[PDB]
Amino acid sequence: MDIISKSGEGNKYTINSAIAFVAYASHIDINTTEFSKVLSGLRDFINDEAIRLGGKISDGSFNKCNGDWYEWLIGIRAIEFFLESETNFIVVKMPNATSFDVMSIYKSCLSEFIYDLRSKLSLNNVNLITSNPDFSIIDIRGRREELKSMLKDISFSNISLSTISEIDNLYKNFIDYAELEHIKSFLSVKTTFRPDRRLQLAHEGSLMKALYTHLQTRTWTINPTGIRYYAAATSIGNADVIGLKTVATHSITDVKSLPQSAVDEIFKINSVLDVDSCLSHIL
Amino acid sequence: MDIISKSGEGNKYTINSAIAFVAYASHIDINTTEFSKVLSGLRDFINDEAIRLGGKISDGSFNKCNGDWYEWLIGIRAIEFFLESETNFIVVKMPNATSFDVMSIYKSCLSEFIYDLRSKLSLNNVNLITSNPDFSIIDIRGRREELKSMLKDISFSNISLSTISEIDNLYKNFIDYAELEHIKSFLSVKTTFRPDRRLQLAHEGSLMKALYTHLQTRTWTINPTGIRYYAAATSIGNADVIGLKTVATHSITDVKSLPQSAVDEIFKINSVLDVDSCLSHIL
Amino acid sequence: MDIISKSGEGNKYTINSAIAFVAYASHIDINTTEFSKVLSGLRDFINDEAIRLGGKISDGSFNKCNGDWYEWLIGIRAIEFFLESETNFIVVKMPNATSFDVMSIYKSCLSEFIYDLRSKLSLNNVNLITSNPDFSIIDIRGRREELKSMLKDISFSNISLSTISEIDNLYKNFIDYAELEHIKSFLSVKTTFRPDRRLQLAHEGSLMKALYTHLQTRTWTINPTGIRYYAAATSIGNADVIGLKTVATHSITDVKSLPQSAVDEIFKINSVLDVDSCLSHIL
Amino acid sequence: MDIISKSGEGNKYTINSAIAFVAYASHIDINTTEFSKVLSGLRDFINDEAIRLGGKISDGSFNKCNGDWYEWLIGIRAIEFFLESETNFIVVKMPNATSFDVMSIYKSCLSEFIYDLRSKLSLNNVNLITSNPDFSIIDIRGRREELKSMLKDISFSNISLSTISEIDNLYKNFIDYAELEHIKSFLSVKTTFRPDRRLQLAHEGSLMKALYTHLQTRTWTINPTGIRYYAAATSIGNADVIGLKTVATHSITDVKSLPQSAVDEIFKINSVLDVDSCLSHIL
């Protein structure tokens, strides 16, 4: 198995994300290397190969992959934090909306309200396009031991391809699972923020808070805990905060509840120690 | 006055948008040339120059400019349509939020409600970041004659640099002007839609409908006309419609009113005849 | 069986409402006698008896009974109208909240939302005290023939004690029956309006519209038909209308929907012909 | 000046409420006599007179007057409590809606919103009938000294006809006065609760909370203090509480805020010591 493979588009090669991450990652000490160095280090590694084999890797595949890597770096450490701690919450990585709907994490009685809304809107000629945040912080009251035994072998130290697959499929254990209070928050990450990315997060944050409010209405849940939506990147600056901490759109139309932010808090995550700090603060 | 000028960034040249548009535009028949041909034709024109002078023009300036040109093409034709018709609505081009707030088009008693909201939110540590749609369709009940005399010389036929300046500053005549019913709709345009652009329009559309709903609440306006938000590009496809006609975010939280779309209708505008069709349909 | 019987409270006698109504009613032509004459005529009839037997009947029993009689007069004619017509709606008399909850007419999935609300409120130390309107206009799509055969013998002409019992227990056929659209309206009646009675109807009307709005929210029913609440008395005057057509209380807090009246229309019902006019207009 | 005077309706006499209250009140020690004894004692006093003069006083005038007396008993003690204390709130007696609108206590910018609502509703053929609670607890930040000097001579001990007039006209000092936070609560009293009276208070309580919510919406006041609505009678029992502590009608339609009671607390006030206890608890 090689790290890159020709996409048949001429000199075009596609990156084998997982293999490349594991092959490169085995060679470094994640605990002493900041995430940004691993990513660029990973970009170079792949370039050498493309040059040996005489090929070309477009920055689109690189950009697609940078996200994968950044998320796996965070996702693995989150599990180690879980293994090493006594918390009731586990940070689970979510697949794309193309193939999965984060709403299905909720019990079916709750998700059906959302399906009911999508159907009624379609009849009025309106769509309901939702996206899945990168991670969901799920309340695992009761199944702590089960998951600890299940996820015992996960770590950067014993990094393997199977580790990546687990991080990527752990969500399957939480389908038709959560009551309204079980999903505590969502966390979406970006290597770096640019105008387009700040926009995505603000919009998604707003949308999650709107849907949550829709569910609180259907179930008539008075004074519920509410959900939080967090954002993180390898580097954050004041200019990023302006656009991310804008009002959740539904709050502009209702004076009855305290105004909510689309994004509740933004975190800088460029290392394993940053993951722990963020997690200790979010849980 | 030349069409390009060195940005001092080495071989870097900046495009003089307005001059280039006028110089090139004088040479073609806008009535027989579809907008996409004028834009590419305009890209080439500028390339020749850069090559004669030995220089480099980044696609960022080109991309910045493509929007300018596309908007001026639409903006000028809208005024001709106005001059040639007997409608009470005029399509006015809006400047960027960096230097202008589209809310100031409303009478000061109305815009103050928005300023009041921004201030109360800031005290709760929440921002209110708004953007300005490209065009506003304004009800000019009464001042039709005045504007017709004022804008008599505007046309593609007698295209000049002063024409561009007028199209770009006409909005100054409508500050602290509109009652809630005077702004009929907004129209935001893109040369072509890409994922990032479909997102921008959907979000902005939602936000405009949320603010409008906020104003209807403050003034307690029962059963108002409502505002529409339209989108247009030189080419539109079914895939674009999926994301643009998604629900306005505030409708997800309220069963009391009919569900609204973030974008009410999308138009294909690749010619002067397309502008007229869209305008006859929107007015 | 006598029309009055000693309540053991000394000279105190209690009126046997049903017997007295039937005994007296058999002697008159309801089709030519206005309701107010039957009521006073019925008051006298009972007085003669009390005098023969040497007894006393307090106006409280009379007042309790006047309502019974007025309602039976309306209730019987409504059934005749049903028997004689081809409508899909039947006017059903409702028992007191002491022993029945009009919400149970709705399917159990709907009434449970109301039970859920009562329970959550009690936990916040708030009560939900509701009252039952006098009549409910129910959509009997499908069971027209069944009911016509069942209610064939009901009329003023063949008035009997069993007729009264049927009018009073017909509601039992509609428990756990209605979908949100099946109950078209409610109708509460009073012999005459006094300040206290105008207040009762206004409050009840408001409450029914609030609960209906609560159900429309739980089920997320967009643009539903809505419910009407009507009032009727043997004589109505402009002064009565002032207080009855006041806003339904929940409309004061929401600009999103058209303002609703607590009482939609008030009818004068002092005869069989008045019942038909009201019914033809309400159905 | 006599305590009763012929209403020209034959043997009919009308009670001169104020004189009778003062004449009788001068003879007793309000501090040792429970309110119910003063009221019955006052009923007898008036009967003696009617008998000496040979006349008849209907219980309607008595019932009208019982309220007056009960309110003056509470109103005078409230002022003594004010004179004797260092509170920023004063309990002011309100006149009937026939001649006064409690909404005018608010600054004109606030009351105009209510006038605006009444006008828009009338255009949709809906009325807005409001009633005035008996007392308003007003925040007198700043004018404590002024009022203390003004109201220095008010007491049961130096009871006079002018004392009654002051208690009844003190409200004139607070017209176009209050900001949304200045009216802390309302208090409506009844000698005793009967079904009709429990209904009145529940409805009025609901209506006040609906209007307050309407004002919070117009001004976009986030997380305001809110208003309370209290009830009091010479004797209260568990059966009274059932109906009075029912939900404020607007709360049934909105899950966004905590459920509010139409009546927040019910007090037993049969003495001067009961007034103080209630006031110390409400302020």
What residue has token string 């500053």?
B169
Which residues on neighbouring strands pair with residue C229, listed in sequence order?
C186
B145 is in an annotated binding site: no
For this entry, resolution in Å reads 2.2
Q: Which of C64, C73, C44, C92 is nearest to C155 (CA)?
A: C73
Query: Cα–Cα distance between B205 and D130 in angstroms, integer?
Result: 40
Annotated catalytic residue C146: no
Beta-carbon count within 10 A of B161 CB: 13
- Asked if B217's CB is within 8 angstroms of A247's CB, the reply is no
Is D204 one of the annotated binding-site residues?
A: yes
Contacts of residues C148-157 at CB distance under 8 Å and 24 or more positions apart, as own/partner, are C148/C82, C148/C83, C151/C79, C151/C82, C151/C83, C152/C83, C154/C76, C154/C79, C154/C80, C154/C83, C155/C76, C155/C80, C155/C83, C156/C25, C156/C30, C156/C31, C156/C76, C156/C77, C156/C80, C156/C272
Among residues D16, D21, D191, D165, which one has the least CA distance to residue D79?
D165
Chain D residues whose CB is inside 8 A of the B120 CB are 220, 222
Structure tokens at A46: 């792949």
Contacts of A66 (CB under 8 A, 6+ apart): A39, A43, A191
Residue type, C157: S
Q: For chain A, which chains pass the contact test of at least 3 CB pairs under 8 Å?
A: B, C, D
Q: Note whether A127 contacts B217, CB cutoff 8 Å.
A: no
Count of residues in chain A: 283
Nearest-10 crossing angle of helices A195-218, A108-123 = 110
Pairwise CB contact (< 8 Å): A256 & D257: yes
Tell me the shortest Cα–Cα distance from D217 to chain B, in angstroms: 7
Of the residues C222, C255, C256, the best mutation for testing chain A's interface (the one with the most A CB atoms within 10 Å of its CB) is: C222
Nearest to C120 among A217, A218, A222 (CB): A222
* A59 noted as active-site residue: no
Amino acid in the structure at residue A33: T
Q: Tell me the three state secondary structure of residue C182.
A: coil
Structure determination technique employed? X-ray
Which contacts of B16-25 are long-range, i.e. CB under 8 A and separated by 24 or more positions?
B17/B64, B17/B65, B17/B68, B17/B69, B18/B161, B18/B164, B18/B165, B19/B161, B20/B45, B20/B46, B20/B65, B21/B68, B21/B69, B21/B72, B21/B164, B22/B159, B22/B160, B22/B161, B22/B163, B22/B164, B25/B156, B25/B159
Pairwise CA distance, residues A217 & A226, whole Å: 12
Q: Confirm whether B265 is a catalytic residue.
A: no
**∠ CA A21-A22-A28 to the nearest 5 degrees?**
90
Tell me the residue type at B202.
A
Per the annotation, the verdict on C12 as an active-site residue is no
The distance of D181 to chain A (nearest Cα, Å) reads 17
Distance CA B17, CA B70 (A): 11
Chain breaks in chain C (C to N over 2.5 A) after: none
Domains of chain B: 1-283 (3.40.91.10)
E strand map for chain A: 4-6, 13-15, 89-93, 135-139, 183-189, 228-233, 265-268
Q: Which residues of C sit in the known binding site?
A: 134, 204
Which residues of C have a CB under 8 Å from any CB of D?
117, 120-121, 124-129, 196, 199-200, 202-203, 206-207, 210-211, 213-214, 217, 242-243, 245-247, 249-255, 258-261
CB atoms within 10 A of CB C270: 22
Where do we find the tokens 């029993």? C61
Q: Per residue in A214-249, is it b (16+ CB within 10 Å) or e — as a string?
A: bbbbbbeebeeebbbbbbbbbebeeebbebbbbbbb
Mutation for A interface: D220, D252, D255, most A CBs within 10 A:
D255
Beta-carbon separation of D249 and C121 below 8 A: no
In whole angstroms, what is the distance from residue B19 CA to residue A280 CA? Answer: 58
Chain CA centroid to CA A174, Å = 15
Q: D-side interface with B, Cβ within 8 Å? A: 113, 116-117, 120, 124, 217-218, 220, 222
Kindly tell me the number of DSSP H helices and DSSP E strands found in chain C. 9, 7
Closest CA–CA distance from residue C220 to any residue of chain B (Å):
6
What interhelical angle do C195-218 and D195-218 show, nearest 10? Answer: 50
List of residues 6+ apart from C56 with CB closer than 8 A: C10, C11, C12, C13, C50
Of C27, C18, C34, the closest CA to residue C69 belongs to: C18
Contacts of A217 in chain B (CB under 8 A): 253, 255
From CA C203, how far away is CA D217, in angstroms rounded?
23
Contact D199 C200 (CB under 8 A): yes
